[PDB]
């Protein structure tokens with residue numbers, strides 16, 4: 338039985354070597370997390386994929402003996418509840434609605450870059466570009482006006498940063514978010530609005546509709562899934578580019594690589610801490626390393642699947658030219674990221690915008706001077722200074 342956390346802490350974007358060791362010699366690894374009883378950890382692409390997408394695993398029926406690192410959401414529902422929720426949400430999250438945002442993303446990011454450029458280097462990628470970009474996008478989806486972007490950014494930070502804010506602070510922020518969303522929903526029930534939240538309020542599946550509680554809870558989910566995830570992923574992707582100079586140079590010389598570079602950076606860059614939420618088997622499931630019986634918990638992180646040499650050639654080397662890229666960074670199957678198209682657009686706009694504005698873009702300090710976050714759900718730099 339392997340104890341998590343593993344011995345030795347990782348710096349920056351490094352992947353703990355134990356996962357690779359387990360992938361080759363212990364593909365159905367018995368593990369003991371800080372809380373709950375023993376579970377299984379899977380690290381091979383096929384197994385991780387199965388764990389996170391096969392309908393024989395449940396996200397809803399977690400319990401006390403469920404392995405976990407800690408003592409409502411669509412992310413935690415199973416079919417058929419999940420299926421109903423997802424059908425309604427997909428009336429708003431459409432390719433047509435997301436794709437029509439392209440121009441507005443470009444102008445939003447260009448304004449943020451102008452301000453950075455006016456102020457002069459060094460700037461902080463995290464505070465000056467990534468965070469304000471992604472919160473603005475989610476505020477547009479929710480109908481939150483420009484003047485309240487800062488308020489949402491702050492409230493999101495509070496409920497997300499579980500080690501930096503107290504339970505009482507998180508309760509207060511959540512209450513504030515929900516009160517604001519309740520007012521937005523109430524306005525959207527009085528007359529149709531065309532923002533994504535107004536479209537969700539108007540969405541119908543025969544007679545079925547989202548309740549006020551489901552709408553409000555989904556607004557909260559959108560701050561964590563859409564803003565916080567995107568902001569951290571973007572900062573980490575920029576760090577990775579700025580520390581892989583040959584790859585960054587290649588992207589400048591060959592800008593048509595940008596879409597593949599974004600997919601490769603999604604595959605490569607770690608976001609969380611390598612465990613993920615347990616899934617519980619509703620029924621026996623044969624995986625590569627053996628059989629998971631009904632009732633047993635399985636942890637499976639996409640980051641480990643995305644380094645499996647069974648699925649990617651030379652997986653521990655960043656290669657932005659990779660054409661075949663079936664990474665699991667947005668998941669797979671029923672829970673597949675509802676915002677993937679928009680996330681991809683965001684990452685292309687930001688990275689493409691950054692490289693075009695700043696040919697001389699570089700870290701403003703050596704990498705050993707970047708301080709990395711230590712608690713909470715996300716890896717990321719505390720501050721990421723750049724110069725140009």
Ligand code: HEM
Pocket residue numbers: 389411412413423478559562563564566567570571639665666667668669671672673674675676677679680
């Ligand atoms: C770089 C950005 C992003 C990454 C890496 C990311 C990744 C993910 C992942 C891994 C999942 C879970 C897949 C699973 O559990 O099987 C997910 C779910 C989700 N994402 Fe994202 N996401 C990103 C951006 C966004 C954005 C911009 C939005 C909305 C505008 C969004 C909305 C969602 C929603 C609603 C779900 C839940 C879907 C469900 O449970 O059925 N995401 N995302």
